[PDB]
Amino acid sequence: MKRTWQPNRRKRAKTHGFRARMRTPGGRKVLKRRRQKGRWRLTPAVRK
Amino acid sequence: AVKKFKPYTPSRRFMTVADFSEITKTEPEKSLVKPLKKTGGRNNQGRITVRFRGGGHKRLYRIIDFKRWDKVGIPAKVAAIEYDPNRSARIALLHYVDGEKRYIIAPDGLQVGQQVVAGPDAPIQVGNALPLRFIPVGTVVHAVELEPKKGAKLARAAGTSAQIQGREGDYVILRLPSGELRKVHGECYATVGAVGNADHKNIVLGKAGRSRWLGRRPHVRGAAMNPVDHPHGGGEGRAPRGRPPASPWGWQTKGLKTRKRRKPSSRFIIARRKK
RNA sequence: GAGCUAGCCCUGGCCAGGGUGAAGCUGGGGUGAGACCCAGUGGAGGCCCGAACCGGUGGGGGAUGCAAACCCCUCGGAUGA
RNA sequence: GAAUGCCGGCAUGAGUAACGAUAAAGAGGGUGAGAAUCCCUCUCGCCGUAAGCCCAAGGGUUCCUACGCAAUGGUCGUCAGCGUAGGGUUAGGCGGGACCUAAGGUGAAGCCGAAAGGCGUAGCCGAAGGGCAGCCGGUUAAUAUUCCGGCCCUUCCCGCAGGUGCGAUGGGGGGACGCUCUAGGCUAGGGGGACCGGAGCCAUGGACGAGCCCGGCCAGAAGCGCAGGGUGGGAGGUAGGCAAAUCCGCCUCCCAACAAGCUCUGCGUGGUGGGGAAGCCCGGGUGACAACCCCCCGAAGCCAGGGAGCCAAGAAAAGCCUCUAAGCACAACCUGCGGGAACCCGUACCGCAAACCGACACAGGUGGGCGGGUGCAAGAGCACUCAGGCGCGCGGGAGAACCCUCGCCAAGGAACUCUGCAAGUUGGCCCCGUAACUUCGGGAGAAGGGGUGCUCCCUGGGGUGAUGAGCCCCGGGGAGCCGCAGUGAACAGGCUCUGGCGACUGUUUACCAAAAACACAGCUCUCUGCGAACUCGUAAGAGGAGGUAUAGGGAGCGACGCUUGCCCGGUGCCGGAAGGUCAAGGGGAGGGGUGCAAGCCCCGAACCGAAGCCCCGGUGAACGGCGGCCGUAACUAUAACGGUCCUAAGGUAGCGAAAUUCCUUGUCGGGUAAGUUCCGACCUGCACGAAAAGCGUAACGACCGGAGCGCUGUCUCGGCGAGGGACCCGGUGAAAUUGAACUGGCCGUGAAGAUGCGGCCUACCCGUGGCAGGACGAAAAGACCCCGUGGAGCUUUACUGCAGCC
RNA sequence: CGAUGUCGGCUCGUCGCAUCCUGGGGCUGAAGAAGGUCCCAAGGGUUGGGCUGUUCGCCCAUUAAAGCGGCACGCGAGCUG
RNA sequence: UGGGAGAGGGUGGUGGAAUUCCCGGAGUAGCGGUGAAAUGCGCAGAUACCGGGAGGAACGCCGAUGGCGAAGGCAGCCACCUGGUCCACCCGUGACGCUGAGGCGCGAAAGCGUGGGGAGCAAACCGGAUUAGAUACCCGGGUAGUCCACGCCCUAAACG
RNA sequence: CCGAGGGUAGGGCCCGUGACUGGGGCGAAGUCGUAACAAGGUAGCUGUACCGGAAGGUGCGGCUGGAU
Ligand SMILES: [K+]
Ligand SMILES: [Mg+2]
Ligand SMILES: [Mg+2]
Ligand SMILES: [Mg+2]
Ligand SMILES: [Mg+2]
Ligand SMILES: [Mg+2]
Ligand SMILES: [Mg+2]
Ligand SMILES: [Mg+2]
Ligand SMILES: [Mg+2]
Ligand SMILES: [Mg+2]
Ligand SMILES: [Mg+2]
Ligand SMILES: [Mg+2]
Ligand SMILES: [Mg+2]
Ligand SMILES: [Mg+2]
Ligand SMILES: [Mg+2]
Ligand SMILES: [Mg+2]
Ligand SMILES: [Mg+2]
Ligand SMILES: [Mg+2]
Ligand SMILES: [Mg+2]
Ligand SMILES: [Mg+2]
Ligand SMILES: [Mg+2]
Ligand SMILES: [Mg+2]
Ligand SMILES: [Mg+2]
Ligand SMILES: [Mg+2]
Ligand SMILES: [Mg+2]
Ligand SMILES: [Mg+2]
Ligand SMILES: [Mg+2]
Ligand SMILES: [Mg+2]
Ligand SMILES: [Mg+2]
Ligand SMILES: [Mg+2]
Ligand SMILES: [Mg+2]
Ligand SMILES: [Mg+2]
Ligand SMILES: [Mg+2]
Ligand SMILES: [Mg+2]
Ligand SMILES: [Mg+2]
Ligand SMILES: [Mg+2]
Ligand SMILES: [Mg+2]
Ligand SMILES: [Mg+2]
Ligand SMILES: [Mg+2]
Ligand SMILES: [Mg+2]
Ligand SMILES: [Mg+2]
Ligand SMILES: [Mg+2]
Ligand SMILES: [Mg+2]
Ligand SMILES: [Mg+2]
Ligand SMILES: [Mg+2]
Ligand SMILES: [Mg+2]
Ligand SMILES: [Mg+2]
Ligand SMILES: [Mg+2]
Ligand SMILES: [Mg+2]
Ligand SMILES: [Mg+2]
Ligand SMILES: [Mg+2]
Ligand SMILES: [Mg+2]
Ligand SMILES: [Mg+2]
Ligand SMILES: [Mg+2]
Ligand SMILES: [Mg+2]
Ligand SMILES: [Mg+2]
Ligand SMILES: [Mg+2]
Ligand SMILES: [Mg+2]
Ligand SMILES: [Mg+2]
Ligand SMILES: [Mg+2]
Ligand SMILES: [Mg+2]
Ligand SMILES: [Mg+2]
Ligand SMILES: [Mg+2]
Ligand SMILES: [Mg+2]
Ligand SMILES: [Mg+2]
Ligand SMILES: [Mg+2]
Ligand SMILES: [Mg+2]
Ligand SMILES: [Mg+2]
Ligand SMILES: [Mg+2]
Ligand SMILES: [Mg+2]
Ligand SMILES: [Mg+2]
Ligand SMILES: [Mg+2]
Ligand SMILES: [Mg+2]
Ligand SMILES: [Mg+2]
Ligand SMILES: [Mg+2]
Ligand SMILES: [Mg+2]
Ligand SMILES: [Mg+2]
Ligand SMILES: [Mg+2]
Ligand SMILES: [Mg+2]
Ligand SMILES: [Mg+2]
Ligand SMILES: [Mg+2]
Ligand SMILES: [Mg+2]
Ligand SMILES: [Mg+2]
Ligand SMILES: [Mg+2]
Ligand SMILES: [Mg+2]
Ligand SMILES: [Mg+2]
Ligand SMILES: [Mg+2]
Ligand SMILES: [Mg+2]
Ligand SMILES: [Mg+2]
Ligand SMILES: [Mg+2]
Ligand SMILES: [Mg+2]
Ligand SMILES: [Mg+2]
Ligand SMILES: [Mg+2]
Ligand SMILES: [Mg+2]
Ligand SMILES: [Mg+2]
Ligand SMILES: [Mg+2]
Ligand SMILES: [Mg+2]
Ligand SMILES: [Mg+2]
Ligand SMILES: [Mg+2]
Ligand SMILES: [Mg+2]
Ligand SMILES: [Mg+2]
Ligand SMILES: [Mg+2]
Ligand SMILES: [Mg+2]
Ligand SMILES: [Mg+2]
Ligand SMILES: [Mg+2]
Ligand SMILES: [Mg+2]
Ligand SMILES: [Mg+2]
Ligand SMILES: [Mg+2]
Ligand SMILES: [Mg+2]
Ligand SMILES: [Mg+2]
Ligand SMILES: [Mg+2]
Ligand SMILES: [Mg+2]
Ligand SMILES: [Mg+2]
Ligand SMILES: [Mg+2]
Ligand SMILES: [Mg+2]
Ligand SMILES: [Mg+2]
Ligand SMILES: [Mg+2]
Ligand SMILES: [Mg+2]
Ligand SMILES: [Mg+2]
Ligand SMILES: [Mg+2]
Ligand SMILES: [Mg+2]
Ligand SMILES: [Mg+2]
Ligand SMILES: [Mg+2]
Ligand SMILES: [Mg+2]
Ligand SMILES: [Mg+2]
Ligand SMILES: [Mg+2]
Ligand SMILES: [Mg+2]
Ligand SMILES: [Mg+2]
Ligand SMILES: [Mg+2]
Ligand SMILES: [Mg+2]
Ligand SMILES: [Mg+2]
Ligand SMILES: [Mg+2]
Ligand SMILES: [Mg+2]
Ligand SMILES: [Mg+2]
Ligand SMILES: [Mg+2]
Ligand SMILES: [Mg+2]
Ligand SMILES: [Mg+2]
Ligand SMILES: [Mg+2]
Ligand SMILES: [Mg+2]
Ligand SMILES: [Mg+2]
Ligand SMILES: [Mg+2]
Ligand SMILES: [Mg+2]
Ligand SMILES: [Mg+2]
Ligand SMILES: [Mg+2]
Ligand SMILES: [Mg+2]
Ligand SMILES: [Mg+2]
Ligand SMILES: [Mg+2]
Ligand SMILES: [Mg+2]
Ligand SMILES: [Mg+2]
Ligand SMILES: [Mg+2]
Ligand SMILES: [Mg+2]
Ligand SMILES: [Mg+2]
Ligand SMILES: [Mg+2]
Ligand SMILES: [Mg+2]
Ligand SMILES: [Mg+2]
Ligand SMILES: [Mg+2]
Ligand SMILES: [Mg+2]
Ligand SMILES: [Mg+2]
Ligand SMILES: [Mg+2]
Ligand SMILES: [Mg+2]
Ligand SMILES: [Mg+2]
Ligand SMILES: [Mg+2]
Ligand SMILES: [Mg+2]
Ligand SMILES: [Mg+2]
Ligand SMILES: [Mg+2]
Ligand SMILES: [Mg+2]
Ligand SMILES: [Mg+2]
Ligand SMILES: [Mg+2]
Ligand SMILES: [Mg+2]
Ligand SMILES: [Mg+2]
Ligand SMILES: [Mg+2]
Ligand SMILES: [Mg+2]
Ligand SMILES: [Mg+2]
Ligand SMILES: [Mg+2]
Ligand SMILES: [Mg+2]
Ligand SMILES: [Mg+2]
Ligand SMILES: [Mg+2]
Ligand SMILES: [Mg+2]
Ligand SMILES: [Mg+2]
Ligand SMILES: [Mg+2]
Ligand SMILES: [Mg+2]
Ligand SMILES: [Mg+2]
Ligand SMILES: [Mg+2]
Ligand SMILES: [Mg+2]
Ligand SMILES: [Mg+2]
Ligand SMILES: [Mg+2]
Ligand SMILES: [Mg+2]
Ligand SMILES: [Mg+2]
Ligand SMILES: [Mg+2]
Ligand SMILES: [Mg+2]
Ligand SMILES: [Mg+2]
Ligand SMILES: [Mg+2]
Ligand SMILES: [Mg+2]
Ligand SMILES: [Mg+2]
Ligand SMILES: [Mg+2]
Ligand SMILES: [Mg+2]
Ligand SMILES: [Mg+2]
Ligand SMILES: [Mg+2]
Ligand SMILES: [Mg+2]
Ligand SMILES: [Mg+2]
Ligand SMILES: [Mg+2]
Ligand SMILES: [Mg+2]
Ligand SMILES: [Mg+2]
Ligand SMILES: [Mg+2]
Ligand SMILES: [Mg+2]
Ligand SMILES: [Mg+2]
Ligand SMILES: [Mg+2]
Ligand SMILES: [Mg+2]
Ligand SMILES: [Mg+2]
Ligand SMILES: [Mg+2]
Ligand SMILES: [Mg+2]
Ligand SMILES: [Mg+2]
Ligand SMILES: [Mg+2]
Ligand SMILES: [Mg+2]
Ligand SMILES: [Mg+2]
Ligand SMILES: [Mg+2]
Ligand SMILES: [Mg+2]
Ligand SMILES: [Mg+2]
Ligand SMILES: [Mg+2]
Ligand SMILES: [Mg+2]
Ligand SMILES: [Mg+2]
Ligand SMILES: [Mg+2]
Ligand SMILES: [Mg+2]
Ligand SMILES: [Mg+2]
Ligand SMILES: [Mg+2]
Ligand SMILES: [Mg+2]
Ligand SMILES: [Mg+2]
Ligand SMILES: [Mg+2]
Ligand SMILES: [Mg+2]
Ligand SMILES: [Mg+2]
Ligand SMILES: [Mg+2]
Ligand SMILES: [Mg+2]
Ligand SMILES: [Mg+2]
Ligand SMILES: [Mg+2]
Ligand SMILES: [Mg+2]
Ligand SMILES: [Mg+2]
Ligand SMILES: [Mg+2]
Ligand SMILES: [Mg+2]
Ligand SMILES: [Mg+2]
Ligand SMILES: [Mg+2]
Ligand SMILES: [Mg+2]
Ligand SMILES: [Mg+2]
Ligand SMILES: [Mg+2]
Ligand SMILES: [Mg+2]
Ligand SMILES: [Mg+2]
Ligand SMILES: [Mg+2]
Ligand SMILES: [Mg+2]
Ligand SMILES: [Mg+2]
Ligand SMILES: [Mg+2]
Ligand SMILES: [Mg+2]
Ligand SMILES: [Mg+2]
Ligand SMILES: [Mg+2]
Ligand SMILES: [Mg+2]
Ligand SMILES: [Mg+2]
Ligand SMILES: [Mg+2]
Ligand SMILES: [Mg+2]
Ligand SMILES: [Mg+2]
Ligand SMILES: [Mg+2]
Ligand SMILES: [Mg+2]
Ligand SMILES: [Mg+2]
Ligand SMILES: [Mg+2]
Ligand SMILES: [Mg+2]
Ligand SMILES: [Mg+2]
Ligand SMILES: [Mg+2]
Ligand SMILES: [Mg+2]
């Protein structure tokens, strides 16, 4: 049946992308946190 | 004069439709319509703040002229009478001798081809708009401003009418369509006659889907829900109210008055409605 | 976190074919005039049968499955909420 | 050494289950160390509204070629979506951007919030909507509307010519719109040809034929033809379109009007440029100077912004045209022509799937377009087939039980069973015919029946064409022929009678409930006079609603019919300018502390003092509630009648052993041979009863009862047959479980149900197919029950707060 | 209670005997036939249906008879639900 | 052809008296009701009195033993639309008549449906009293209805 | 071919009968009240509506076949 992951590049970039994170205080804390951990990727990769 | 159907479906058995006999023009005046933003009953937060709204027919909003003291003294011709899905009344298209075109709600008895006018000097004729102080006592009027220059507020629904009861100083006593006796200011405008389309009340929607067309989504009885949802929720099997009948939010709903106690307009209500 | 699901908003798209035959209109009759009757025309409907499509009624299978809800038979809706 | 411990390693089950749709395979020839599995050929089978083709999303090199086979591939592998390497994606016109707006988002102004932030007009962003210029063929191993060829077009810059009051983010027009139905004329697409072109064929009894087989086009500028769409001309006045305006709007006059004209599309033709089969021969070559014509069918597509009807009344903005404003009229615009200029991103490949979403090369899920022929009434249904694509990545045997899916069955025919569960029966079309009841629509496909193929003969009407022939489409009548059977295969209702519930079509517990539940039109009550009530928010601000009592909120009831009685003492709500209580505050009789004192400082009575409560009324489609005991009639029995106690008032009409009745399978009646169910009645209603509605009701229901007819493998009662497994052989090879095990029966005993203790009996060692009685078999630290001064949801006249409101 | 699945049916039986039938008896208020009551006896037998979930019971039609009990109210790693 | 009387009908208007309610004023201990009372109402200011407003219904005197209509029935006043009828003149037609099964229409009150309206009255209902009882008569309340529009119902001591 | 009639299916009319149920007629001396005839002690009758153990009451409109 229809499953839960229905990939969509515009949805992905508009929800989790870099600019979405920076627009709000929680998203900037995400980026600060993920930088501090040393994540190679701050944000989901989406081929756009 | 409402129209019936034969019982050739279970719903056609009872469905009644307006006769649309007064309509003379079946498309709106392009320069006078603008897109009506649908809400679904959601507010700027995105929250349902009025339950059970949405999914009705698309409509364009026709700009109605609730002032008319814009154009004091300039007569107009009644060019057409049209359908307006944003209100119960029909609307009337007016070609002014000015050359400007406007919409008013169509009073009962208005005929295409007649001419109307607005101002202190106007004939006491169906369709004319005067400051309330110049209308003789006992005249049936509609589209009444509640305050001067602020716009026609009262008696706009199909078949409604307020009647002038008498004068007191700068103020006139109107009997509103509810039966309240209010003092409206004399400089407030109003239009002679009652609103048209009186048979509007006699329409039988006939079936559920009709209400769906009008944007009315199904309405759930509190008695049908659970305690998390509504004072009347829960109970094993059916259940009486089991407490004073209440809204989803707790307050009582059989008799409890809710007009604000100290409202400054109280100095101007003479008698609350009856019936 | 509403890329699942629930509702609403904007903008598009889809619904083989067949059946029933409302109003109206036309003619005929009727009558003081009417109501009304008859025929034809007409093509209404949360109308009827049935694919697509949306479903999931009963039974059987499946049960370390093909599948963390599937398969077969059968069944509901199918211009409409 | 134990923690259902943690991490790892390795065992057991076991050479066991399985190897993923039952669409299906066989042989020959290649290659190679090695072949059921790769390549080629022939034969066979499967899909064909797809299992074929083209887009979009998502995927991201998977594409093509060479060389490879350790791992991946459920087997094998020489093969591969796998490993290594090289190659491959070409645009002014296709899509998106340098254009426009939609919801929404953002947001100069402005507003609000302890901070973070929340709003917000314009504006800006935002597409699969609007707008905008490319068709056909050829070419590569791999791209092509992109390269090439032919024929077309767009915008920008500049120049020349002609023309004009030129000029905009401003005004206006237009853009610009629904649902159903639908005309005319085309096109796409298709059928036929005794006409045109073609390599060839004559078989096995016949055919050298008006024979068989194949093919008979595509694109195209301007003109022209056909069919459509859009569109009045002129003048005078003008105060409106937030300046102006010759535009638009409004008014008057003249003319024109189903037209025409003008303009814009579609289709046809059109210089021209392409293509071109079967068969044969080795993707090609030949066919071939290929031929390219006639008739019919014909769209849901095109003309298109077409037409009619209906109510639920159907985006915006830019391009574009027009009007003027500053300005400027050496300019500028418009038209024609010429030269020049024309950027960025995508383009491979998969794409109903082995490449996307499902941990898998997973029987699941995934939006758009094309989707051929014949026959069956039609169709995208069904069967078979074209193009095209596949035989589903383990095979070979055997022909037990048993399982699954399927076929048939003597006599009986529901006797099966909780239940006809299941499976039969019926089944399309045409014709005849069709009941109670009814809201007059219906019930209705009621029920029940007859017809159905093929051949000959005669004949009626329609479309095209021409009025005819031909082709096509509906029929009618007569005579015959064959079979068990003519919707001969496939697809395609079993029916009736009678109850309960719900009016109805709808909706629901994604993944155990589809219902009588929810919803529903309709009825009532109540609130709300608009800066409404109500809702969300600290607020600003929103929704309500660009609505205004024929409207909006809340509540219950639930189409429709006939109806909905009595109780206001308690709770709620509504009304009540008296009274009673009533907090802060006012007041200050009178006290107190301290100081020598002026003073400073504390306590404080009467009295005034709101809402709330008390009190007085109203109010039931507000919360709710609607009696007991005793007696009495000329047979008896029973009480119309009476007595008395109590209540705020004592259940009305209509229903009643009921979706309610405990005693109960009540009693009587019906139906059966027999009826705890069913239907109809009676009424001592444990414990109906009137909008938590009462009693009915045509129609409707995958709802739940009862009966009958039909017909059956459900059954008496089983039998045989088919395929896929199970079994055997080659290949690959799991699992939960497991203290160790050298693991028998009885009668006893034992923590009370012993392979393990006692006594006796029985028993050579090890397997394979089977069956499930035991191993208190496995799985899940019982979900029932209790316990914990453990937790959570929910309630209220439990406690105490808070919002909100007064 | 770190689980001993719980009514009834179906299927499959097996045991007890306090015997329903069939075999053998004594007593009889046993004339015969038929029966009553008790003793011995477990070899075999012990039907089909209507009603209800039922066990049980009632009822219809038969019968030699239409027995009563145990086996975790025998039997859900055998089915049903 | 000329005239006449009339609550004949339909539509639209509109006048005053009265009752009730509401507001203001003035005012105080009762009012009301009956056979007698009680319920009820009233110091929370009633009744009685004056001014103001809202609304519905019915039209006093004229009024008659009257008039009109086929019957049911029709009564302030005004206008419009419309039926019948009588008299005069003796002008026109030339028996064109009477009745009338069926048919059709009209048809008081009550009653019914959908809207409205609602002052007074008042089935049902509640209370007070009377009474053996009193589901009545009498009293205080009181919902349909009475009124309007449309559509039904079609009855009668629809009687002379 | 027609055809008595047999069969299957569905209708219409009549007759008999049926748990139970509705009122009706009648029946020497039952129970409850007193509605009508006198102004019958609320004049009566009336069509209709609602109500009540029962006769009846009440409303609305009508008739005198109403007394004084
Ligand atoms: K329990
Ligand atoms: Mg889903
Ligand atoms: Mg999605
Ligand atoms: Mg996307
Ligand atoms: Mg997208
Ligand atoms: Mg998205
Ligand atoms: Mg983003
Ligand atoms: Mg976001
Ligand atoms: Mg921050
Ligand atoms: Mg990582
Ligand atoms: Mg790095
Ligand atoms: Mg992130
Ligand atoms: Mg009808
Ligand atoms: Mg109208
Ligand atoms: Mg506009
Ligand atoms: Mg809005
Ligand atoms: Mg916003
Ligand atoms: Mg937001
Ligand atoms: Mg709401
Ligand atoms: Mg809503
Ligand atoms: Mg409205
Ligand atoms: Mg309207
Ligand atoms: Mg005012
Ligand atoms: Mg209307
Ligand atoms: Mg309404
Ligand atoms: Mg609507
Ligand atoms: Mg609604
Ligand atoms: Mg509801
Ligand atoms: Mg409701
Ligand atoms: Mg509930
Ligand atoms: Mg519930
Ligand atoms: Mg919640
Ligand atoms: Mg609650
Ligand atoms: Mg409750
Ligand atoms: Mg409940
Ligand atoms: Mg209950
Ligand atoms: Mg419930
Ligand atoms: Mg309760
Ligand atoms: Mg409450
Ligand atoms: Mg509130
Ligand atoms: Mg009011
Ligand atoms: Mg979603
Ligand atoms: Mg459809
Ligand atoms: Mg269809
Ligand atoms: Mg027809
Ligand atoms: Mg028509
Ligand atoms: Mg037709
Ligand atoms: Mg139908
Ligand atoms: Mg339908
Ligand atoms: Mg049909
Ligand atoms: Mg589904
Ligand atoms: Mg299923
Ligand atoms: Mg079945
Ligand atoms: Mg499962
Ligand atoms: Mg399936
Ligand atoms: Mg199927
Ligand atoms: Mg259907
Ligand atoms: Mg539609
Ligand atoms: Mg230890
Ligand atoms: Mg361990
Ligand atoms: Mg473990
Ligand atoms: Mg542990
Ligand atoms: Mg571990
Ligand atoms: Mg390990
Ligand atoms: Mg290691
Ligand atoms: Mg290991
Ligand atoms: Mg092993
Ligand atoms: Mg084994
Ligand atoms: Mg396995
Ligand atoms: Mg498997
Ligand atoms: Mg299959
Ligand atoms: Mg197949
Ligand atoms: Mg072979
Ligand atoms: Mg082979
Ligand atoms: Mg090799
Ligand atoms: Mg091989
Ligand atoms: Mg090999
Ligand atoms: Mg193979
Ligand atoms: Mg090959
Ligand atoms: Mg061969
Ligand atoms: Mg096909
Ligand atoms: Mg390998
Ligand atoms: Mg290898
Ligand atoms: Mg290998
Ligand atoms: Mg290697
Ligand atoms: Mg492998
Ligand atoms: Mg695999
Ligand atoms: Mg490539
Ligand atoms: Mg190009
Ligand atoms: Mg540029
Ligand atoms: Mg933009
Ligand atoms: Mg804050
Ligand atoms: Mg954006
Ligand atoms: Mg954009
Ligand atoms: Mg776009
Ligand atoms: Mg383009
Ligand atoms: Mg082109
Ligand atoms: Mg090359
Ligand atoms: Mg438009
Ligand atoms: Mg528009
Ligand atoms: Mg659009
Ligand atoms: Mg519509
Ligand atoms: Mg063409
Ligand atoms: Mg064809
Ligand atoms: Mg003109
Ligand atoms: Mg001007
Ligand atoms: Mg076009
Ligand atoms: Mg050649
Ligand atoms: Mg289409
Ligand atoms: Mg369609
Ligand atoms: Mg079009
Ligand atoms: Mg806009
Ligand atoms: Mg110059
Ligand atoms: Mg020009
Ligand atoms: Mg650029
Ligand atoms: Mg490409
Ligand atoms: Mg592809
Ligand atoms: Mg699929
Ligand atoms: Mg597709
Ligand atoms: Mg693939
Ligand atoms: Mg596979
Ligand atoms: Mg798959
Ligand atoms: Mg097609
Ligand atoms: Mg073909
Ligand atoms: Mg067919
Ligand atoms: Mg296969
Ligand atoms: Mg396979
Ligand atoms: Mg397949
Ligand atoms: Mg074997
Ligand atoms: Mg199969
Ligand atoms: Mg067969
Ligand atoms: Mg045979
Ligand atoms: Mg048989
Ligand atoms: Mg039978
Ligand atoms: Mg039979
Ligand atoms: Mg049976
Ligand atoms: Mg049954
Ligand atoms: Mg069942
Ligand atoms: Mg069958
Ligand atoms: Mg069939
Ligand atoms: Mg019948
Ligand atoms: Mg019938
Ligand atoms: Mg019936
Ligand atoms: Mg009928
Ligand atoms: Mg028929
Ligand atoms: Mg039939
Ligand atoms: Mg025949
Ligand atoms: Mg034949
Ligand atoms: Mg034969
Ligand atoms: Mg069928
Ligand atoms: Mg029937
Ligand atoms: Mg239901
Ligand atoms: Mg239903
Ligand atoms: Mg019901
Ligand atoms: Mg009903
Ligand atoms: Mg319903
Ligand atoms: Mg439906
Ligand atoms: Mg479920
Ligand atoms: Mg569930
Ligand atoms: Mg679940
Ligand atoms: Mg299920
Ligand atoms: Mg259902
Ligand atoms: Mg529900
Ligand atoms: Mg409901
Ligand atoms: Mg109702
Ligand atoms: Mg809130
Ligand atoms: Mg708040
Ligand atoms: Mg708004
Ligand atoms: Mg509401
Ligand atoms: Mg309900
Ligand atoms: Mg009470
Ligand atoms: Mg009270
Ligand atoms: Mg109370
Ligand atoms: Mg209480
Ligand atoms: Mg107070
Ligand atoms: Mg109580
Ligand atoms: Mg009653
Ligand atoms: Mg009973
Ligand atoms: Mg019942
Ligand atoms: Mg029940
Ligand atoms: Mg009960
Ligand atoms: Mg019982
Ligand atoms: Mg019982
Ligand atoms: Mg019984
Ligand atoms: Mg019987
Ligand atoms: Mg019964
Ligand atoms: Mg009894
Ligand atoms: Mg209730
Ligand atoms: Mg209840
Ligand atoms: Mg109730
Ligand atoms: Mg009825
Ligand atoms: Mg019913
Ligand atoms: Mg019914
Ligand atoms: Mg249903
Ligand atoms: Mg159902
Ligand atoms: Mg049956
Ligand atoms: Mg069998
Ligand atoms: Mg076999
Ligand atoms: Mg062997
Ligand atoms: Mg092996
Ligand atoms: Mg392997
Ligand atoms: Mg050991
Ligand atoms: Mg050992
Ligand atoms: Mg052993
Ligand atoms: Mg042993
Ligand atoms: Mg023991
Ligand atoms: Mg033992
Ligand atoms: Mg042993
Ligand atoms: Mg031992
Ligand atoms: Mg020992
Ligand atoms: Mg031993
Ligand atoms: Mg032994
Ligand atoms: Mg073996
Ligand atoms: Mg074995
Ligand atoms: Mg075992
Ligand atoms: Mg077992
Ligand atoms: Mg065991
Ligand atoms: Mg154990
Ligand atoms: Mg065990
Ligand atoms: Mg066991
Ligand atoms: Mg488990
Ligand atoms: Mg634990
Ligand atoms: Mg435990
Ligand atoms: Mg547990
Ligand atoms: Mg316990
Ligand atoms: Mg304890
Ligand atoms: Mg405690
Ligand atoms: Mg404790
Ligand atoms: Mg606790
Ligand atoms: Mg808690
Ligand atoms: Mg707080
Ligand atoms: Mg336990
Ligand atoms: Mg364990
Ligand atoms: Mg366990
Ligand atoms: Mg247990
Ligand atoms: Mg059995
Ligand atoms: Mg004897
Ligand atoms: Mg024996
Ligand atoms: Mg039994
Ligand atoms: Mg038992
Ligand atoms: Mg029993
Ligand atoms: Mg015997
Ligand atoms: Mg036993
Ligand atoms: Mg046990
Ligand atoms: Mg026991
Ligand atoms: Mg027991
Ligand atoms: Mg089981
Ligand atoms: Mg069992
Ligand atoms: Mg077990
Ligand atoms: Mg069950
Ligand atoms: Mg007093
Ligand atoms: Mg005083
Ligand atoms: Mg009033
Ligand atoms: Mg004469
Ligand atoms: Mg009448
Ligand atoms: Mg009394
Ligand atoms: Mg007395
Ligand atoms: Mg008289
Ligand atoms: Mg015979
Ligand atoms: Mg006596
Ligand atoms: Mg007597
Ligand atoms: Mg008397
Ligand atoms: Mg008396
Ligand atoms: Mg009675
Ligand atoms: Mg009375």
PDB file of C-alpha atoms (C1' of nucleotides) in Angstrom, chain D residues 625-636:
ATOM      1  C1'   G D 625     -40.031  13.591  37.942  1.00  0.00           C
ATOM      2  C1'   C D 626     -44.675  11.547  36.766  1.00  0.00           C
ATOM      3  C1'   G D 627     -47.948   7.015  44.306  1.00  0.00           C
ATOM      4  C1'   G D 628     -49.614   3.447  48.340  1.00  0.00           C
ATOM      5  C1'   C D 629     -53.135   0.471  51.240  1.00  0.00           C
ATOM      6  C1'   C D 630     -58.450  -1.176  52.044  1.00  0.00           C
ATOM      7  C1'   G D 631     -63.473  -1.965  50.416  1.00  0.00           C
ATOM      8  C1'   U D 632     -67.459  -2.400  46.752  1.00  0.00           C
ATOM      9  C1'   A D 633     -72.141  -5.070  41.512  1.00  0.00           C
ATOM     10  C1'   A D 634     -78.564 -10.193  42.681  1.00  0.00           C
ATOM     11  C1'   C D 635     -73.831 -17.203  40.817  1.00  0.00           C
ATOM     12  C1'   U D 636     -68.873 -16.621  40.847  1.00  0.00           C
TER      13        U D 636
END
